[PDB]
């Protein structure tokens, strides 16, 4: 149960994600991400785009059906009042791309946690343009301590949960629709 590993999909839960958060140590803004692949396709890591922040973890390179990937991110170290915000992209064996936005801000007086999930047609790397699409145009979900579901198209659907604080857990399940 370390970031950068894959685990059995059924093993993914908030406990595993707190373990991942705990291993980052007591930094101010951090995220543990778990994505359960029940899509019937194999996923291959493409890249992570960071608007702000960093990860020392290599995306789990291959995520088979029935496995969950674990990942993390943290704010840039030092006296910078910024959070951790980015987009993960995995290529799926059907030729399309699974994209996941996460956004954990610095200042909770003014901003909140958000996430999103989308399938793109073709093989599309995560980048600033994708961040802008997922954040400003494709109806992101609040990290509001509740579950949110949506159909993804392509025979898939998503269900996920993110909490509201600056030590964020993001648990996502991708299933057949
Ligand atoms: Cl906000």
Curated annotation (Swiss-Prot):
Changing residue 114 to F: In W112R/W116F; loss of ability to bind membranes. Pfam families: Anemone_cytotox. It is found in: Secreted; Nematocyst; Target cell membrane. N-acetyl-D-glucosamine 6-sulfate binds at residues 49, 51, 136. Has been engineered for DNA analysis in nanopore technology. Keywords: Cytolysis, Ion transport, Lipid-binding, Membrane, Nematocyst, Secreted, Target cell membrane, Target membrane, Toxin, Transmembrane, Transport. The record marks 58 as: Protrudes from one subunit (B) and inserts into the hydrophobic cavity from the adjacent subunit (A). GO terms for biological process: cytolysis in another organism; monoatomic cation transport; pore complex assembly. An N-(acyl)-sphingosylphosphocholine 4 binds at residues 131, 136. The record marks 14, 147, 161 as: Part of the hydrophobic cavity (in subunit A) that receives Val-60 from the adjacent subunit (B). Changing residue 67 to C: In V8C/K69C; loss of ability to form stable pores after addition of a new disulfide bond. A motif (Cell attachment site, crucial for protein stability) lies at residues 142-144. Changing residue 14 to A/G/P: Loss of pore formation ability in cholesterol-rich membranes, but no change in pore formation on membranes with low cholesterol content. Residues 103-118 are annotated as: Trp-rich region, which is important for the binding to lipid membrane. An N-(acyl)-sphingosylphosphocholine 2 binds at residues 51-52, 83, 106, 111. An N-(acyl)-sphingosylphosphocholine 1 binds at residues 29, 77, 166. Stable up to about 53 degrees Celsius. An N-(acyl)-sphingosylphosphocholine 3 binds at residues 114, 135. Residues 1-27 are annotated as: N-terminal alpha-helix that contributes to the pore. Octamer or nonamer in membranes. Monomer in the soluble state. This protein has been found to bind carbohydrates, since it shows a substantial delay in elution profile in size-exclusion chromatography. The carbohydrate pocket ovelaps with the lipid-binding module of actinoporins. Composed of a long N-terminal alpha-helix and a core region rich in beta-sheet structures. Before the pore formation, the alpha-helix binds the lipid membrane, partitions into the lipid-water interface and stabilizes the monomeric molecule on the membrane. Finally, it traverses the bilayer, thus forming the transmembrane pore. PANTHER family: BRYOPORIN. Belongs to the actinoporin family. Sea anemone subfamily. Pore-forming toxin (PFT) that consists of a crown-shaped octamer or nonamer that forms cation-selective hydrophilic pores of about 1.5 nm (inside) and 13 nm (outside). It causes cardiac stimulation and cytolysis (EC(50)=1.6 nM on erythrocytes). Interestingly, the Phe-14 is crucial for hemolysis. This is DELTA-actitoxin-Afr1a.
């Amino acid at each position: 149960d370390v970031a950068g590993a894959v685990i059995d999909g059924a093993g993914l839960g908030f406990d595993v994600l707190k373990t991942v958060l705990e291993a980052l140590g007591n930094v101010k803004r951090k995220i543990a991400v778990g994505i359960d692949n029940e899509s019937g396709k194999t996923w291959t890591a493409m890249n992570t785009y960071f608007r702000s922040g960093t990860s020392d973890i290599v995306l789990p390179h291959k995520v088979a059906h029935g496995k969950a990937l674990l990942y993390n991110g943290q704010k840039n170290r030092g006296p910078v009042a910024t959070g951790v915000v980015g987009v993960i992209a995995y290529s799926m064996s059907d030729g399309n791309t699974l994209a996941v936005l996460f956004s954990v801000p610095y200042d909770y007086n003014w901003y909140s946690n958000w996430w999103n999930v989308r399938v793109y047609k073709g093989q599309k790397r995560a980048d600033q343009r994708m961040y802008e699409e997922l954040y400003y145009h494709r109806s992101p979900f609040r990290g509001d301590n509740g579950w949110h579901s949506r159909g993804l198209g392509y025979g898939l659907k998503s269900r996920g949960f993110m909490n509201s604080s600056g030590h964020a857990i993001l648990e996502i399940h991708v299933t057949k629709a």
